[PDB]
Design an enzyme around this catalytic site. Sequence first.
Site, mmCIF file in Angstrom:
data_model
loop_
_atom_site.group_PDB
_atom_site.id
_atom_site.type_symbol
_atom_site.label_atom_id
_atom_site.label_comp_id
_atom_site.label_asym_id
_atom_site.label_seq_id
_atom_site.Cartn_x
_atom_site.Cartn_y
_atom_site.Cartn_z
ATOM 1 N N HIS A 9 0.852 -1.151 0.000
ATOM 2 C CA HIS A 9 0.000 0.000 0.000
ATOM 3 C C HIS A 9 0.914 1.234 0.000
ATOM 4 O O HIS A 9 1.492 1.632 1.032
ATOM 5 C CB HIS A 9 -0.906 -0.119 1.238
ATOM 6 C CG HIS A 9 -1.789 1.056 1.514
ATOM 7 N ND1 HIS A 9 -2.572 1.657 0.552
ATOM 8 C CD2 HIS A 9 -2.076 1.693 2.685
ATOM 9 C CE1 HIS A 9 -3.266 2.646 1.104
ATOM 10 N NE2 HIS A 9 -2.979 2.691 2.398
ATOM 11 N N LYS A 30 -0.521 10.730 0.064
ATOM 12 C CA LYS A 30 0.453 10.134 -0.829
ATOM 13 C C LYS A 30 0.255 10.588 -2.326
ATOM 14 O O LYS A 30 1.198 11.151 -2.935
ATOM 15 C CB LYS A 30 0.440 8.603 -0.680
ATOM 16 C CG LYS A 30 1.009 8.085 0.652
ATOM 17 C CD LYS A 30 0.595 6.649 0.921
ATOM 18 C CE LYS A 30 -0.947 6.497 1.135
ATOM 19 N NZ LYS A 30 -1.513 7.442 2.211
ATOM 20 N N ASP A 48 -1.549 3.990 -4.913
ATOM 21 C CA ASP A 48 -2.315 3.263 -3.882
ATOM 22 C C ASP A 48 -1.828 1.854 -3.586
ATOM 23 O O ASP A 48 -1.575 1.529 -2.438
ATOM 24 C CB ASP A 48 -3.837 3.288 -4.155
ATOM 25 C CG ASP A 48 -4.507 4.537 -3.589
ATOM 26 O OD1 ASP A 48 -5.211 5.246 -4.365
ATOM 27 O OD2 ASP A 48 -4.302 4.820 -2.371
ATOM 28 N N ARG A 114 18.118 13.704 13.178
ATOM 29 C CA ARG A 114 18.505 15.098 12.946
ATOM 30 C C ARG A 114 19.892 15.235 12.349
ATOM 31 O O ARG A 114 20.184 16.229 11.695
ATOM 32 C CB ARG A 114 18.301 15.978 14.196
ATOM 33 C CG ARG A 114 16.900 15.769 14.835
ATOM 34 C CD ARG A 114 16.234 17.037 15.369
ATOM 35 N NE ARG A 114 15.770 17.927 14.312
ATOM 36 C CZ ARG A 114 15.657 19.247 14.444
ATOM 37 N NH1 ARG A 114 15.971 19.839 15.602
ATOM 38 N NH2 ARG A 114 15.221 19.975 13.414
#
Lengths: 181, 161, 160, 164, 181, 164
Positions: A9, A30, A48, A114
């Site tokens: 998906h 998305k 999808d 980070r």
Amino acid sequence: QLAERRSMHGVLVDIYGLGVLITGDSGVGKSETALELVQRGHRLIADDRVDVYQQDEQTIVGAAPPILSHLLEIRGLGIIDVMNLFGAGAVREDTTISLIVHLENWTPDKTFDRLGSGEQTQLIFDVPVPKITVPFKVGRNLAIIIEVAAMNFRAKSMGYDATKTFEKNLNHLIEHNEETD
Amino acid sequence: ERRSMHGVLVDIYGLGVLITGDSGVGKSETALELVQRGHRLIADDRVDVYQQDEQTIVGAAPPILSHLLEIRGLGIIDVMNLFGAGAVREDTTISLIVHLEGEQTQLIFDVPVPKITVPFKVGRNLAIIIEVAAMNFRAKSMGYDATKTFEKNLNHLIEHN
Amino acid sequence: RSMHGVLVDIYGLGVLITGDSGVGKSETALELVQRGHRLIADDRVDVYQQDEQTIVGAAPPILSHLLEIRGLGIIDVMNLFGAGAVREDTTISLIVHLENEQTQLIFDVPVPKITVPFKVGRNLAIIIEVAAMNFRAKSMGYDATKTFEKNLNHLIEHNE
Amino acid sequence: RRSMHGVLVDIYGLGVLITGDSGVGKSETALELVQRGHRLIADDRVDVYQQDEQTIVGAAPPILSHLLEIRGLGIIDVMNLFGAGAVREDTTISLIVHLENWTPGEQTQLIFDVPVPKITVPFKVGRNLAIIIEVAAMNFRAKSMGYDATKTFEKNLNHLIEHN
Amino acid sequence: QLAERRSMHGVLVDIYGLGVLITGDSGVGKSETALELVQRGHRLIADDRVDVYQQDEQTIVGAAPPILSHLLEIRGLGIIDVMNLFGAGAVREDTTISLIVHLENWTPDKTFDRLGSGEQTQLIFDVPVPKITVPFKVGRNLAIIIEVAAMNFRAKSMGYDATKTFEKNLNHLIEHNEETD
Amino acid sequence: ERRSMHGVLVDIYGLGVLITGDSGVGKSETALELVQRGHRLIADDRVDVYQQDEQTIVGAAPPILSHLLEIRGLGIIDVMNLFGAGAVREDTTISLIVHLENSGEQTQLIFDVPVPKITVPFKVGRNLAIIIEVAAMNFRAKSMGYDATKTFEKNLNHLIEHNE
């Protein structure tokens, strides 16, 4: 030469030559992002739902399930044929999958990478595919984050590490910093 | 598992194409035109090609003279360095040969790789030609071409009236 | 001295973007490089006066043209986008303070300043670009505000 | 504070003076650069002067401002056609680039004392000067930042021969 | 609307909203130029042959002859479908024709318009259609000349006229050149 | 005889599109996105429209207001001035209405021309330029025989029958 095909998906695109599989909770969009990525010159492989298979011990190939080929769903407007709207240089039947950019809801429970140092990974039929995880925050420019994730993945793979470059001159910088007088 | 061909290996819209044939100070200069338009250089001048599937060639960058091109008047430029990571690539499969100055083949390691010879004369916007060559090869393999469009048109003309 | 904020060369005009937290200055800078503009420095920008009128901003000798994107880590702009994306320095001309007429002395010099409220799903890239373009237009003649108003003023003076 | 011949543009922020023969078609290259995001400062008649020992500057004359002439179309106004991203009042010149009809080591040229790095490029019949000049400019900033590429290729080729 | 149709040899594009008809000779490269133009965001209406018709006494509509719709010939490699290669945003079924850009071989016998003064015209069904004549010199960038022609043509339509701006400062400028000793 | 409507009239790929229904966001901000992406502004805020024949509406710019936008934060900007002649147009037939609300295939009469309309469910995040772009492109494609239901059918038949 047709091996097993599991199903996933997300959104498979080809950004600057890299197959990048976007995953996420819905309510991120998305596919809105997919489209903005094809405006910017990238290729749609699957929206999808994405077929994947193994091919080497270190290579997965993604494709759209034939039935859904070229099709893209815009929650709201309707379903479009991306090839018809954007032409052939906008769609591709397949790509290897170098990178998953998993789209995660910005909750300040835990934290994010980070330095770019983390090496998370997601197993797909034996292959651990490199993965990364960006916060979503309604009206971030996502297309661009994905574009940069891709570029930076190719850079590193080629020996340009930005992270390493910065660990390497951390002291010089701190030295120039403190010199705030 | 090794080899070496003369030409330019570009990734145009995700498709690998090998431009063979010098002159027009082409190739180099053209590899360039292509990069400023958003495509990817794998290798200028000399390409290391090997064989994947029983119908798949892969072309690769040398680990040495890697992503460099040479332009007369300024010398050697580093594509990655000037253009950034979106401009360079390392791999692609080779899907189409575009040969400079109908539809053909050219095998390299008993893979009949599709080829096309462009009759070239001097002014030519070659970038756009290679670009369109690529798109059309991807269009063809998906069921589309001028002759199907032209028959749709003849049919609409003959009938709707 | 030396300052906090993002210094960009937008169509040749040095703009200091000095926005708040959250709403990442840095993704903004990224999108600007993508659109053809140049990063001089993110955070810790080295500015230093030059004329009683003009003001420079430059990049530290170290770790210039680096940028942190949350999730992605440390990215190198020159590397990712190549050389038309970075620039060693620029005369600052306008400061855009993001939010969520006016001015700002730096080394005493009065620097023109603008404030954008930012809002739920606003593209700063584009507003900042426009502020910069418009600045150079105002700065060259062409007001638009002042022109609209005269044309309006005479529009009102018309009637029958 | 004198005056000069050639096209002055800001290409990704680098002031580049284009000088070139006639038939190489300068203004039209100017126009192509404008279309690709760059700034015209002045097309011919550029007002150049000195700033510091190192630094030369070029500005638009108070009056020609952003006009240029294209054979067949006549006089066009750059700001008016392309808007405000396409023109600029002044820039430091960093690099002179001389186009060439003629066709048969590094170069330089003089303004107000200052040596100004010069590059020369042969216009071979059908080549894209916009692209070339862009690249020259970017490459001049790469060089100027430490990344040579010429020097690195040579150094990499050296150790390669040695690798025997 | 089913009125009379003449046929003209050229290339009908919509540049920035304006219909422009590109005429010229073989070897000028009408259709390669077409293609660059559609690469650049413009829209193809007709390659090689254009159907035109009058619609009122100041307005001409041009279209592709239906049989040749979407088709474009590149002597380089054959015939392509421009919709398939470039998507829907690249093609348009018609446009009014604001401007004829006639491409001329650069031979030293004619002088060319050096101001934008000239106001040449070509009649098409009673409508005097504005027209401009640019020299071709192999290797020039026609795509941009044409784009600027379009833009400049709309500029003038709207009251911005670089030619008048230049005239009205001819003297101020000349004063300033001698002001260089 | 002219009327006048609230909205933004843009030329996207040659298709006249009228965005109605101000998502507080600022349709004028969306008109903005569109001009930086290459499309044309006919008129922001209020748009003058008239009929031209049954089945055809035209959309023109007032002679006053005229290619101006107000952007909250910097004020009034002149689109022709900042973006240039390619960013603005005097008029355009209106082929499609896109209604930004904060199967379908709806219509909306303007002078007894039914004018194709599409409503967009809007929540905050949306890239709207891209939605409007896509709408434009799709209206064109549809007008020409292409759909996605046809694509889906083609795919269905390929899968059922195992190739062509």
